Design a protein around this ligand. Structure first.
Ligand SMILES: NC(=O)c1ccc[n+]([C@@H]2O[C@H](COP(=O)([O-])OP(=O)(O)OC[C@H]3O[C@@H](n4cnc5c(N)ncnc54)[C@H](OP(=O)(O)O)[C@@H]3O)[C@@H](O)[C@H]2O)c1
Ligand SMILES: NC(=O)c1ccc[n+]([C@@H]2O[C@H](COP(=O)([O-])OP(=O)(O)OC[C@H]3O[C@@H](n4cnc5c(N)ncnc54)[C@H](OP(=O)(O)O)[C@@H]3O)[C@@H](O)[C@H]2O)c1
Ligand SMILES: N#Cc1ncccc1CSc1nc(O)c(C#N)c2c1COCC2
Ligand SMILES: N#Cc1ncccc1CSc1nc(O)c(C#N)c2c1COCC2
Lengths: 262, 281
């Protein structure tokens, strides 16, 4: 059972926090009295988010602006965020590259950029954060999608990047378990959320009910605080009924007997 | 005689019962075909009388595969050597392979970057290279091949793994690349359905196979039963020929019982009615 006091005084990074779900997570963490470091490219918007976090009751709030297309920025950002807070308890990986609903034809540049921003930068940030998270027995929270568990047309590049996060982070979760690395990994499987970006992108194409961004942001934080392996959040009860894959969990357990990781 | 012959191999029961004559005279590309499963696929295709174009980096080993394909009965066999780390090579390779055969019926995407079993710590270079070679080059090859495959109502065959459907430790970079193939190719399969692109996409989910590379890599770390490479290679070809969406091949009857995900198929069908793609069609 989650309690908001679980975030009180915790040192948290939130990426993609100038708008949508990321901004809502920064606001919830501020209300809970966490220390926050927010990032995105928009310095001016991040200044406004930080000012608001301080008004809401954050223990401290800072922003560092930059692009996650730059792997050197991603690595340096974590070191600076850790230096500002004097450590790190939770790393919330939420940013994505700008995308739109379109059939795939020949835009390899978009496929590669989606893989670099939505996936590879999450790996770089994790590698940079791990020493601090090992010190605090901390948590990594990876924001994904229903399009990271099942297939959807018009989002091929985006879906490939979200599926990649599952393969990568679920593999390292198994490694951390056997290697006694006490850092939790929470994969958040979200359905359609009413962010301005998503609502504009889907307009006239997708008619699904969108879930509220404020509640979505809180469910992600709860999942991370509770060290849950997966969070599922969607407007539909049929989606919630069908999304889990118990057979995958059974197979992984059956194959666990076949290792010597010494 | 060929000019006085016509007809179709794919009649009643051809979506469920394979015959080697289904590959007779078909124009096929096999990547990663100098060794392991790819080499075995080139040999099966040769025995079936297909036209083959094989690729890998090793000019000398590909030379030997081509020579054996011709001995086995291939209608024609050629190789083009190069690295799939080079996206210009991948794009140009498909154009040259198509020119050699006078078209393309099946694109078998099988190559991977050299890897090993290790805990992940900080090798970002291996993560990026795995994504470039095992995933991005497959997309480049598909884009280059699609005009020819649309002309022949052809097939794309994507070689994946159980580590592309469930999580496994010690193969994080590799697993991320295989999961990426599922998300990408399964999304475009849905797009081709609505856009009336008659090109099938077969995702092959393979368990441990007795290739020299895999057997060396798992030695003393993974104690699992390995399935035979020759039978594996034939099951991949059969799935592609029958235009199956997925092929599952593993030594364990338990894996084959549990690997399918009916809930994912149900959800996708429920969401299939959730859109209006009329501006794209
Ligand atoms: N909205 C939905 O329906 C939905 C559904 C499922 C999952 N999700 C997941 O939820 C997360 C947030 O989605 P959202 O709808 O809140 O998106 P959003 O409102 O568009 O926000 C995207 C955030 O990422 C930042 N960003 C974009 N390019 C960047 C780059 N190169 N470097 C660093 N930051 C960058 C943006 O700020 P700047 O432009 O200032 O950099 C912004 O802060 C994503 O992981 C997404 O996949 C959303
Ligand atoms: N064996 C298994 O247990 C197993 C299990 C599940 C799935 N699979 C899948 O089966 C497929 C074949 O695996 P395998 O065991 O047969 O592999 P393998 O015997 O190691 O063969 C790898 C092939 O890819 C080529 N290759 C390597 N690097 C390349 C590069 N940069 N550019 C172009 N070609 C390159 C290799 O030749 P060069 O070095 O001469 O380029 C060789 O022809 C892979 O998709 C694998 O993921 C295998
Ligand atoms: N374009 C765009 C865009 N903008 C903001 C966030 C995500 C995106 C990517 S579109 C997208 N992203 C998802 O995660 C889901 C789910 N579940 C869905 C879509 C669109 O189709 C409905 C379901
Ligand atoms: N290293 C290596 C190497 N060499 C050849 C092919 C694949 C690889 C990558 S290791 C690898 N590849 C897979 O696809 C599976 C499955 N299922 C498994 C392993 C290793 O653990 C057992 C399961």
């Amino acid at each position: 059972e989650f309690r908001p006091e679980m975030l009180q005084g915790k040192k948290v990074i939130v990426t993609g926090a100038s708008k949508g779900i990321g901004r809502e997570m920064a606001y919830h963490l501020a209300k809970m009295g966490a220390h926050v470091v927010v990032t995105a490219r928009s310095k001016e918007t991040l200044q406004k988010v930080v000012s608001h976090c301080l008004e809401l009751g954050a223990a401290s709030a800072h922003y560092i602006a930059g692009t996650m297309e730059d792997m050197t920025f991603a690595e340096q950002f974590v070191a600076q965020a850790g230096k500002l807070m004097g450590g790190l308890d939770m790393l919330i990986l939420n940013h994505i590259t700008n995308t739109s609903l379109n059939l795939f034809h020949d835009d390899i540049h978009h496929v590669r950029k989606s893989m670099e921003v939505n996936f590879l930068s999450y790996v770089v940030l994790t590698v940079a954060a791990l020493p601090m998270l090992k010190q605090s027995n901390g948590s990594i929270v990876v924001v994904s999608s229903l399009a990271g568990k099942v297939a959807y047309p018009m989002v091929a590049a985006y879906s490939a990047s979200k599926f990649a996060l599952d393969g990568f982070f679920s593999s390292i979760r198994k490694e951390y378990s056997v290697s006694r690395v006490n850092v939790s990994i929470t994969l958040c499987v979200l359905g359609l959320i009413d962010t301005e970006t998503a609502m504009k992108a889907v307009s006239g194409i997708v008619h699904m009910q969108a879930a509220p961004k404020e509640e979505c942001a809180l469910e992600i934080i709860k999942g991370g605080a509770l060290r849950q392996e997966e969070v599922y959040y969607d407007s539909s009860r049929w989606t919630t009924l069908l999304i889990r894959n118990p057979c995958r969990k059974i197979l992984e357990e059956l194959y666990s007997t076949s290792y010597n990781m010494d």
